[PDB]
């Protein structure tokens, strides 16, 4: 597991890769910004954001919830995401 997370290639462990693939990823190797890209696609596509208060994402009965280990997060409090990423990315 990484401690500190430009252009550097990551390989996501299988649980994360599944979510990125559902989001549309055609790849096994990603940049960090390609991971964030597909992660936001996933929330969009699955409509996990709260529809009145769209900074809030409800991820509780979803494979993403399982990864983040929270029922909800705020896009303005992105810690659960960054922490999940260092738990789920192999940094070569």
């Amino acid at each position: 597991k990484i401690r500190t997370l430009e252009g550097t290639q990551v390989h996501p462990r299988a649980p994360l890769l599944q979510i990125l693939k559902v989001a549309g990823a055609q790849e096994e190797v990603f940049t960090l910004k390609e991971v964030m890209h597909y992660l936001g696609q996933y929330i969009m596509m699955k409509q996990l954001y709260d529809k009145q208060r769209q900074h809030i994402v409800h991820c509780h009965d979803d494979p993403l919830g399982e990864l983040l280990e929270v029922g909800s997060f705020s896009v303005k409090n992105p810690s659960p995401v960054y922490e999940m990423l260092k738990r789920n990315l192999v940094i070569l």
Partner: peptide, 11 residues
């Protein structure tokens, strides 16, 4: 604001 506007506004 929409979720995707908020999302791309991230470090």
């Amino acid at each position: 604001e929409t979720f995707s506007d908020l999302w791309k506004l991230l470090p």
